[PDB]
């Protein structure tokens, strides 16, 4: 949204195709099309769909996935280097991948994502609640201090379910108890089990 380079997206399973060898065609033509528009930012989504710790076995094995991955790697790095490609990849898990997918600088800057500790929770609540009309009798720091270990989407669910919990009344703008009951839906994972622990 902010930068204005030739930006390019890519999903994981969109690469592997029913026939044998079409992923090589697809990734090679993708690199060509991005290279002919040199300020090129390639976005990769779910690399772990095609990134796999490969295996030697018998009687079974799914091969062409590693063929498309080796296409990606070799046309990415090594012989015939390029200077104008920019890569952004995003996975949800890590150790599925080959070490030759990274190693140091197949992808260079290894960047993890932390979860909101305490303060960024109230920050994210403020961000998504910026559009709603609030009767501002709300300490968001209370809410960030009670909701432990949520993501941004769970705080968004808090925000929207608080809006429609206020709309259960339907009369007016947001109250603090609207946020409380939004939490009380987003919280659990309900247990309530309880037994043998006296």
């Amino acid at each position: 949204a902010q930068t204005k380079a030739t930006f390019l997206k890519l999903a994981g399973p969109q690469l592997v195709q029913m026939f044998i060898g079409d992923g090589a065609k697809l990734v090679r033509d993708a690199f060509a099309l991005a290279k002919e528009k040199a300020p090129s930012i390639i976005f990769i989504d779910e690399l772990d769909a095609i990134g796999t710790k490969r295996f030697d076995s018998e009687k079974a094995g799914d091969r062409e996935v590693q063929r498309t991955m080796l296409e990606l790697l070799n046309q990415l790095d090594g012989f015939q280097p390029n200077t104008q490609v920019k890569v952004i990849a995003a996975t949800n898990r890590v150790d599925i991948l080959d070490p030759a997918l990274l190693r140091s600088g197949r992808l260079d800057r290894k960047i993890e994502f932390p979860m909101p500790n305490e303060e960024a929770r109230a920050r994210i609540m403020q961000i998504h609640s910026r559009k709603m009309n609030v009767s501002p009798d709300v300490n968001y720091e209370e809410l960030a201090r009670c909701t432990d270990d949520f993501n941004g989407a769970q705080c968004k669910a808090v925000c929207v379910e608080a809006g429609m919990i206020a709309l259960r009344r339907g009369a007016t703008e947001l109250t603090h108890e609207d946020y409380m009951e939004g939490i009380l839906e987003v919280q659990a994972k309900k247990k309530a089990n309880l037994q043998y622990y006296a």
Binding site: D22, A24, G61, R67, N74, F79, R103
Partner: protein, 107 residues
């Protein structure tokens, strides 16, 4: 991985500078029946003629494999494409000055 297995052959590709047919060995198979076998025949004829040729096939394990108990059908033509190399690297007509440089991620 990352020991510069590529760049050593690339340094040879900046030392002899003769006929480096650096096959990436992943963009060979496209979709068809016997096209890859014909490309292998073409490379071996071309290497036979231009007498100082250097064969280089990076990331072999995609096209190599080992063997199967006959699972996915495309693996049949994979193994035939590999047995193309298995025959015509040795055959009966022995190659001459056909030096093959090979690199892998897991051998």
């Amino acid at each position: 991985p990352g020991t510069g297995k590529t760049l050593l052959a690339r340094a040879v590709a900046s030392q002899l500078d003769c006929n480096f047919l650096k096959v990436v060995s992943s963009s060979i198979v496209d979709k068809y029946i016997g096209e890859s076998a014909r490309l292998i025949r073409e490379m071996f004829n071309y290497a036979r003629d231009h007498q100082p040729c250097i064969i280089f096939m990076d990331e072999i394990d995609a096209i190599g494999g080992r063997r199967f108990s006959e699972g996915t059908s495309a693996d049949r033509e994979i193994q035939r494409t590999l047995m193309e190399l298995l025959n015509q690297m040795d055959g009966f007509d022995t190659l001459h000055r056909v030096k093959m440089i090979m690199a892998t991620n897991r051998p």
